[PDB]
Every structure is written in structure tokens, then in C-alpha cells.
Symmetry: C5
Subunit: 307 residues, 5 copies
Amino acid sequence: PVDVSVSIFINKIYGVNTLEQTYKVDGYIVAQWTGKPRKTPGDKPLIVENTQIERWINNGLWVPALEFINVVGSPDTGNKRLMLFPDGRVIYNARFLGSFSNDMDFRLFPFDRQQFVLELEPFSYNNQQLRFSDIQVYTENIDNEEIDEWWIRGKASTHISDIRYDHLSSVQPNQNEFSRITVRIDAVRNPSYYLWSFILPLGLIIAASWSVFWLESFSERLQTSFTLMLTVVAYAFYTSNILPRLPYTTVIDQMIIAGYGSIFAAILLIIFAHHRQANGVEDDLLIQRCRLAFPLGFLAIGCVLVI
Amino acid sequence: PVDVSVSIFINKIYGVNTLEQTYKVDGYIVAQWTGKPRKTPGDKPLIVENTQIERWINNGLWVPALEFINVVGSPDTGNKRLMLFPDGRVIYNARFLGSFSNDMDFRLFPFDRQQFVLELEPFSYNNQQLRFSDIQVYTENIDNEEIDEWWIRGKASTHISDIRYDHLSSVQPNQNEFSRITVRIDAVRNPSYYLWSFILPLGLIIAASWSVFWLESFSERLQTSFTLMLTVVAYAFYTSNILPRLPYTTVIDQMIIAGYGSIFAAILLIIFAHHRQANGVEDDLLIQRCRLAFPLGFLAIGCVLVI
Amino acid sequence: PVDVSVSIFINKIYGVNTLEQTYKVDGYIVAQWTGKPRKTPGDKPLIVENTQIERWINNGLWVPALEFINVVGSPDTGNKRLMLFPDGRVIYNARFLGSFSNDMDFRLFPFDRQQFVLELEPFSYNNQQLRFSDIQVYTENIDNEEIDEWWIRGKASTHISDIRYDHLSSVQPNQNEFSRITVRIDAVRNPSYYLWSFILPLGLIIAASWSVFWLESFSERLQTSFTLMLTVVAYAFYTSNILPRLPYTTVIDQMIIAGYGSIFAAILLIIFAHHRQANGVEDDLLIQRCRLAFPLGFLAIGCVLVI
Amino acid sequence: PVDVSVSIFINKIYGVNTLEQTYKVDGYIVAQWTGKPRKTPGDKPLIVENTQIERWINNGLWVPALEFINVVGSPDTGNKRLMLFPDGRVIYNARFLGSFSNDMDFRLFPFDRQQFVLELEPFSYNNQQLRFSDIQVYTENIDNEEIDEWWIRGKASTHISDIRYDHLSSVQPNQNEFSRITVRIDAVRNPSYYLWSFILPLGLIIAASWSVFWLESFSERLQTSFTLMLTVVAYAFYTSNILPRLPYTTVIDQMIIAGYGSIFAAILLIIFAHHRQANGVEDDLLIQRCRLAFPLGFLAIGCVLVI
Amino acid sequence: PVDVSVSIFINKIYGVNTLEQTYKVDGYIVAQWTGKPRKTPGDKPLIVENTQIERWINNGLWVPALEFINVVGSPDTGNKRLMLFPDGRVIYNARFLGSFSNDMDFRLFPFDRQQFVLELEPFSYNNQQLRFSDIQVYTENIDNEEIDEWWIRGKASTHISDIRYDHLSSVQPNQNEFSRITVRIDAVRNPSYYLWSFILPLGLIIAASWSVFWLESFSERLQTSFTLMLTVVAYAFYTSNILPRLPYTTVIDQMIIAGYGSIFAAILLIIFAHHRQANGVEDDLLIQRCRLAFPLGFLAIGCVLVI
């Protein structure tokens, strides 16, 4: 069972595809194991870069393929390196850029909490053939949180485990528990942009929506609400065009629906006030002055949405 | 006739292209057959990964090309593997990411029922040369339905069959029925987002459209319907910009048309009421009070559209 | 002069780029010719798949490059196959996906009639070296026309011809008429989506535009037309964002212009009616009642646009 | 100094990226030179296609790399060909698709005059090693100008010249003037679509904007201009979403700004008319009748913009 | 310690991805070092182009891999060249197109000051093995600033330094300070387009917003501001669709918020004026005439935003 020591260096995490639940990672992989002692020129470690690596493999050098389990497609591999020590030990170093998959919940956008995961596992060698001795992850990030879209919180969670496959090759005894490395990085979304440019004015719209009751005439009260309705549509559009596409409603989406509801509820009351009468024009002096009733009734329903 | 046992592992199904009728699948293929007994180092099965596979083929190893019949373009192949057993048997394992084609009906969006199909067939070897002994599909999915766009329903329907080609080479005996594997996975669209963010407010618009009849004056009744018309246009825009592009109308599309019709019908009636008179301003006391006539007349036409 | 028999199998025609006048084709090519008799293992035809083909060419196997004349870029090639018969004959089979170029007229969108063309020609061998004996095309399509964007009409038109190049090497006798295969597939656009979701409501807008004359007051008549103008703009936007980009106007585009014209003409008349007077407020009783004059005058100009 | 004769065949020029100042070219390159006499099978010219070319270079065939100086990225190379004559001369023929860079001025859009440039230069061989003897360019285009986005005017300008590099190796004598071929193709944009679908209705908007002065009341005059302002915004959006992205304003963009100005100027005058008084409601009978003053004053400013 | 002389030629800097903090660079790299004297054919320098380079490396030619530290993905490499002199020295020349990463602050858009950085470092060889002797950068740009999106200011800033890695191999003496080249190019955004097409009309909107106070009636004053609110939403949409996506607010974004505030503040005062009375309709003769109070009060808050 070959003991493999792994090191991951994370340079950049970007390009989150919400719909695909995907994110891009740039960094380096270092994998170390001890083979049989070699004779290197001089005695210093031998360096074998890109193209030459294949040439060594052909001559019988064992270099196990390490698969990224949760990679979408196949990574852009930059430079490759083999460091061959005379004492036997071998070090493989390579830069990579890949698209990774993970379960991502965006319900509470733009206040998401996400975690970026990497799953490493030998493509063909089982736990008895190849085993992950240890792993360290270096997230050389820091500073300038207000400049980046995501705020990295922890350092990097790590877990070496053994994954069992129940249906595999023509083997039944115990060659079935490939060892898997799982790296987890917690992150929080920078909610500044969405708060100031989306939440805030949307609030002002909903608030100004209620100002329709301060109008004197019934015709004024009613006709103005159609423009108000059309305003919310225009905002929904502005929101939808810029925000990330999802298969579910976010907090903002709910706020939008709330806006439609408030205006429609106002429409109903306005018509009601006018025609619920004991003459014809008996506009209920109190109901027309619900200028304070449902604005705070909206704040009650809004606080109920938090529950 | 070589007996080939196949195994497909499906990891992820995403990125449906409605216009192209296309979807992306990430997973692994396992193919097994029995060749002539080999002499492996020691006696344990020999593993041959990526690059080295070509080398073995060059020395005469028979590795038949299995084409994905319904693939669009050519799949991103990740790691490849050959497992060579001394008793003869050979196992080929490879990860893939592909775009696949299938007939997709989107007429009843967002309540579509779709099925994701995979078609496997030997590229060059006919049924008498190469035959598919059996196939098992593993869809290791489950849980979190309300997080994913699509809800997988069944487990995986499978069909091994023999496909006859009527026009081939200048060969005449019976070498024309290549064996094909067909995998089918049924799926249902998560309609939640479209119901709450599209259907619901659209309904409110159509409903509030009818509130034009509660207006007193004729000028009021008429002018307001122009803003109402403009509102439906703004919504059609908002709808179209976000919804998938299709060469046919969906349920939502029909709802939009219905909205245009309701308003246009109201325009006609409003003008009619005013000018269908026995004086000039004889606005038919009952026709102006069709505030209940066609809202339910719309619910009759709406229920007729279900038939 | 080598006689080459060709067979093209078309699987899918999709992804029309209007601006580039491009379309994507997936299918197979089969090329057959007779070489010098070989000695195959056993006596049955020898199969040579992908990688091994290059190896045979290196040893002197003549495999002539067939260029797609009207291909944009270079096709994604899938699996390749050589079938080598002992009697000499050779069959090359390959799957392809390419972007192809052709003159495409979109003036009468969404009622275009298009034809998809394929042009095959030997890259380096002239008519006296290599000649196309025959060609058959199999468009295995059928059914579900209302599901697909395009409706294939005929079977496939075919033409083998000889193309003369006037400027090549310093060669004079007659090595200049490369033989070219030209496949033509006629198709019609599925106009349903555009009729119901674009043409229909656009018509309703234009028709409702004329309802401005049923307004009593001059201020009502004029102010309302500004909303009406703004409505057409919103529609032009909705249209333009969804419809394909073109360097020329379509039928729909012309409809839009007609919309602007109707409203602008109305604006002119409205102002004219009011100020062409014998006092100040002499709104010409008949010109204000042009509520029927130019709606059918628009139907006369619309029918003139067909001529 | 090897004399190289070059021939470029241009098939298609498309996909202009305005922001990148890029355009796509599909075509063929023919390069000819005379080497030392060979012994070809028989005596006829020997053809060496794609893969086999590398094999010949490895055996010492000199095939100089010709770099496309203004190519963005590296060209999609289709088929390659070497024609080897027994008298010594060599012809290299290859199809290419590339993204090319050139200074592009889009100030006067949609009336741009552009020129598509190609720059060919030997990658490593200087004028004393390799020299471009002659070059002919074939632009096999013609007809259907109203169908294509761009109208090619000339026949293609050519220039062979010598480019001196001042900073190279520690080399001082005269190996520093690589020979460069420069091809120029002049072209004009098809302005039809932008004239009818953008310029024309934008004109109508600006013209109708001035109709605000024919309104009787001050409140009518003022309130209507806010819808008018909103109309220009909607148009700017419609324009911006469809037109190419640029880092500078075009003619159309200026027209938009003119629209904003006209309305804002009207706003100022309207308010001024009302409040510049000798009583309070003394609306200057002449200034309110600037229904003709600044429409033609706009046509004076518009004709000044041409200067 | 091998002395390496580097030369970078920058042809084009384009395609800035604001979200990814990425930019594209086209150019050439020249690397020079002196090896052991060779015997070249004749005596002149030997040129080895693309494919042939690998062949030389296989035979023991040392060609050290130089990694682009801040590259996203892996560069499109064009033509490669080796120049081998007999005196020993070796010159490697290659064209590249890459996506590079750097900290980019876009807060003060469209008046950003950015700097494009390139970081070069040997992939495997430390400062004692390989050392950067010198570097010169040639930015052959100039002229036509008003045609390009970015205006290059300086000539490039250059810095050779030694980067120490703290966690490496089981090596302890001092093999840890790889030598790194850092190139910096300062640039300024061309603000013309955003000033004239965004800032200017946005200003006119805000200015015209304040014209609501010149309206006589309270109903006019209030109802008009709902259109005015809707106008700002339409503008935000227009802005957001065309401007670059960021995770923070820009100057323009702030201007938009200011617009929402101005209108909402106006709404509050308008309602206040009307209902803050000593009777019912005592609209405060001075507060209604704050037609000049807060327009300059906004110019005070606007000037305070600069502090």
C-alpha cells in the first residue's frame, strides 16, 4: 500500500455558475510517494518537466492517475513536473484550472453561505494499492474583502476517508474501498451591492406604493396604482436581467411578489371603499385612511416571513 | 461474437438546451469482455492507464470503439483505464462528459415531462462480431429535490436491441444488425419558480385588468386600459427575457395572449357601451356592469383551454 | 482516375447562425474506392479504427483527404474507421459535426425558405486523379414537425460536377477541374411561435392604436398617443431582444415601422383637426371621425406591401 | 535568399468584434519556393497530406513557419498539403480560420468605412534568408450585397515591404529586416437595417417630442414631457441592447443625447413661459408658440453637427 | 546559476473581465541563456521551429519551463522557436495569448486607474539553479487614444525579485527563493462614452426631477412623481444591462441611489406640505417653493460625496 502525501495550493476561486452549481479553481497539486532508490546524475534530485514525463512512464515509471471526482469536464493542465530523488521518493507538481461541482443552496440570496469542495481519489488504485498518507491545504488568501465577490471564512476543512463501491471490477474480496481526499472551504457572499442597489430602492418602491391612499379622489387613487403596478414589473425585469438564474425563488424574488400583492390588495380595497356604501359614494372614512393600517401590516407579514 | 457487459454510472444531468434539444451528462463507462488468457506480472490483474493504452493497441490489443449514437460533438474524455486479467477478461473504464440529443417536447412548460436517453453502439463491429451481453445503469442520485431544477423519477429504463442498416457496404450476407443499448431516464421539471414568479403575478395582472369596469367615467375606463395594455407588454418582455427560447408557444405564452385578448375585448366593449346608444351617452347599465360577466367568462375560456 | 463512391448520413441539422449564415450538421461520411488486392488475416475484411489509421498511412496506404468546401472552421471528428477488403476495395467511415456556410436570405422572416448545402471536394487530387463515381444521401428524418424549429421538405438534392480553377500551379494541360459533390436540403421555418407570440399581439397593438379617435377631448386624444408611442417602443425592444440579429429589415420589422407611422400620422391629424378651423375649436366633425378611414387605409397599405 | 511566392484565397469575412477590433477570415494559403531537385515516384509531383508532413520535416525537409502577425490567438488549421515537384519546387497549401486584429474606427456608425488587414511574415527567417517574391490575392466574392452585412468595395490592396526590428539578439550586422506581406480589403457597412429600424423611428420620436407645445394647459404641457422623457430612456435601452458595444459615442448615440436635450430644453421653456410673467399666468403668447422656433432650431443644430 | 535574459513584446491588451479581475494579453517572449558551445551546420546559428523542439529536448537539450504565475488557465501558444548558436547561447522565442489575473479596483468607475501585471517565474528551477539576469519590455503602442477603450500611460514598470516559499521539499539549505519577474503597465479608462451617454442624461433626469415643485396642484405634484420614480427604474435597468457586473457599487450606482432618494424625499415633502396645516389645505407657501432649496441642497450633498 503506497503511502501518498498530497499538498493543494489554492490560488483563486471564481466564476460561480449558479444554475450548474459549478465554480472555477486555479492552483497546484503536489503528490509525494517513495519508490525504489534511483541513480540520479551527480546525486542531486532529477527534474523532469512536461513532455519528458511521458517518456519516463513509457520506460516503466509508475505515475498513478489521480482523478478529481467532482470535476466538470477535464481540467486545463498547465505545467507538469516530476522531481526524482535518488533515495527513491518522487514528487509530482502540476498547475490546474478546473470547473468543480457541488450541492449549492441559493435560497437565501444574496445572503448565501456556500462551501467549495474538492474531491481527490486515485482513478484505478484501491486503498490496498494506494493510500493517502496525509494532506495539507494552503489557502494563501487574505485582505481586500470588500473588493472580492466572496469572503473566505475558515482556513480549509480536510477529510481523508475510504469510499466503498458496491458494484465494481471482477473483484469481490476487499479491493473496493478507494481512499478519497475531501477539501472543504467555507465562504460568504458580499451582500453590499445587492443591498444598496436592489433591496434599498425596492423598499422605497413598496413604501411609496402605500402613498396611494393619501390621494383625495377615487379616480386618482385607482389610476395611479396601475402606474405603480407597471413600476414593479419594470423592477422585476431590472432585477431578473442582472441577478443569477435559479430554479427557485430567492428573498428578493419574494419581495417582488410582496410588491405585487401590496398593490393588488390596495386595488381591491380602493374599489371596495368606493362601492361598499350606504348611498354610492360613502368611502369609509377609516378604510380610506388605512394609510397606516397595512404599511405596518406589511411589516408584520414581512417579519412573519422571517419565521 | 464477443459478449460485452456494459455498466454506466451517471453522476450528473444538467444544462438542458431547449432549442437544440440537448443535455449534458457526466459519468463513467465500464465495458467488459473476455479475451485470450494473458501472462500478467506476478498474476494480479494489470492496470494500464491513459497514455499507455495506445501503446498496447499498437502491439495488437483489440479495443473496440464504442460510439455514443446520440452525442452532439465529441465527449470530453477524462481518465481512461484498462484492467487486464490473466484469465483473459478485459475491463475498460473511462469518465465522460457529453452533450446528448433527444426529441424534447416543451409545449406544456413549465410542467414538462422529459426523458433523457443514451444510445450506445459499436462503431464498426456488427452483432455477429460484437454483441452486448448485458447492461446495468447506476443512477446514484437521491434527495434534495427542491434544490435541483429537475426531479428524477424512476430508476433507469434499459433496452438492448438490434439495429438494422439497409444501406451499407458492398457486403451482402447478414452483417447489418449492430447491437444497440438504449438507456432512458424519466424526469420532471421543478415548476415552483415559474409558478410563484411568473404564473401568480400574471394572474394578478389579468385579474386587475378586469377592474377597469369599476371606473365611473368613460374616459377613465378607456385611457386606463392603455396603461394596462402597456403593462402586459412589459410582462411579456420580462417573461421572454428569462424563459427558454422555443419555436412554439408554451402555456405561459398562451396566458400572455389571453391577457392581450382580455384587454382588447374590454377596449371594444368600453367603446361599444359608450356609442351603442339611443341618445349619445346611453352607457348600457348592464354592459358597463359586466364587471362579473367576463372575469368568469375568462375562467370558462381558461377551463376550455384545458380540454 | 480513381472512382470514389460516397455516402452521406445526416443525423441532425441545428443551430442556424443568421448573421454568419451558418448551420451545424451531425452525420457520417462513407467513402469507397478500389485499390490493389490485399492479404487480410484469414480472408475476411480487415477493420482499422482511429489511431491505427495513421499507422497504415505511414506504411504507404493511400487515404486521400476530402475537404468540406463550405465548412467554417474544422469539423469535430468523432470515430474514424477503415474497412480493408482483400479484393482491394477500401471503405472509410467517420462521424462528423461541422459548421457550414451558405447564402441565406432572411428577408421574409419568419416565413423563410432555406436550403442547407454541403460541398465535398478532394483537397489535392484532380478529376484525372480522383473522380466521384456516385453519391447517395440518407436523411433518416421524419415525423414531429411541430416539435422541431425547421421542417425538412424534400429528400435531398444531389449534384456531382466539375469545378475549374483558373489560377493554380504552373501546370497547363488540364489538371484543373477537381470534381465536386453538392448536396442540397430544402427546409421551411416553423412560423407558429412568431405568429402567435409576435404577429398577433403586434396586430392588436396597431388595431388598438386606432381607438384613439373614439376619445372625446383633444387633450385626451393627444396625450394618450404618447403612451401609445411608448408602447410600440417597448414592443420593438421585446421583439429585437428575442428575434435573430440581421443586417436587414424583416416583415416583422416593417410591421413595427408601420406602427410608428400609424401613431405619428394620428398625431399629425389630431393636431391638424384642432387647429385647422374657422374659429379655434372647429374640430372637423368628419376628420375626427376618421375612426374608420385609415384603419382600412392601413389595410390598403398593408395589402400594398404584399405587392 | 529564398524566393517565396504566396497566394491567398479569401472565402468568407465575418464575425466582427467591435470592442476587440477583431474579425474572422476563412481561406487558404499557398506558398511556393524552389528547393533542390528530388526523385519522386514515377516523375509526377509527390503529394504529402496532413500527418505525413511532420514525418518529412523530421527527415530534414525545410518547411519555414509563416506567422500571421495580426492574428489573435492561433488559427484553426484545416487540411494541410505539401506538393513536391521533382524539379525541386515545393508548394504548401493549407486552409485556415483565424481571428485578426486591426485598428477599427466606429465613430460614424452605422456609416463606417473599414479595412480588413492581413499581415504575413516569416517567423524566424530574415530577408536575407527568406524573401517574398510576389503575392496575389483572390477575393472570389460578388453579388447579393443586400444580403450580407458588409459590402466589399475594392479588389484587395497588396504591399510587400521590409520591417526592421531594432532590438533583437546581440546581433549587429543586417539580419533584422524581415519581409512582410500586407493585404488590405476595403469594406462598407450595410446601413439599411439601422436606418429603417433605428434612425427613422428615433426621428419620429424627436419630432413628436416637439408636439408638446400644441397642448393648451400648462399642466398638460409639463406632465406629458415626463412620459416623453421616459420614452427616450426606453429607446436608449432598446438601442443599447441591440447595437454593438463601444468605448465611444456613435452618431446614433449623439441623436439620443439630442433627444434628451430637446425634451429638457422644452421643460425649461415650459416652466419659464408660465412663471416669466407680469401677473402670474402670463404665458408668453409667442414663446408658447415656439412650436416652430426650435424644431427648425434643432435642424440648424443638427446640420451644425455635420460640420 | 544560469543567467537568463528575458524580453517581452506586448502587442495588444484587451478583454477585461471585471468580475474575474482578468485581462487578455497578446505578445512574444524571448528568453536567452548561454549553454555549452555547439557544432552547428556551417557555423551560422541553427533554427529549430515548433514540432522539432520536442525532438531536441528528448536528445537532452535543457529547455526550462517558465511559468506565468498570474495566468488564468493555460495560454494559447502560437509559433515556437529555438535559435541555437555555436558559441553556446540559446534563444527561445514564442508568441502567446493569455488571460491574466490581478487585483482590480473598480469603485470609481468609469474613472478607474488600473495596472496590468505579468509575473514570470521558473517552474522548477530555484535562484541557485536559474537566475533572471535582466529584462526589457517593449510596449510598441502609441496614438489613437480616443479609439481604444484604455489609455496606456507609462512605458512598463519592471521588477526582478526573489520569492521565498516557506513550505517545500525536504530540502533545507537555501533552495527556496525562486527568482520572479514582475511587469507593471499603468492604464486609464476612456471615460468619454460613460460621461456623455450615462452621466449627462442621468443628470438631466435628476435635475428634471426637481421640476415637480413648479406644479400647481397637489394631485399633480404627487402623481407625476410616480412616473418620475418609474423613470429612474427604467434608467437603472438601462445602466445595469450595459455596464460591467461588479460586486460593489460604482459612482454611477451611487448617482442612481441619489435619484431614488431625491424623488422619495420629494414625495415625503409633498405629502407633508399638504397635511401639515392649520386648516387642511395650508400648503406651506415656502416649503412648496423649495424649488431651489434642495436642488442646491443636492449639490451640497453631491459635493459632500466627493469628500
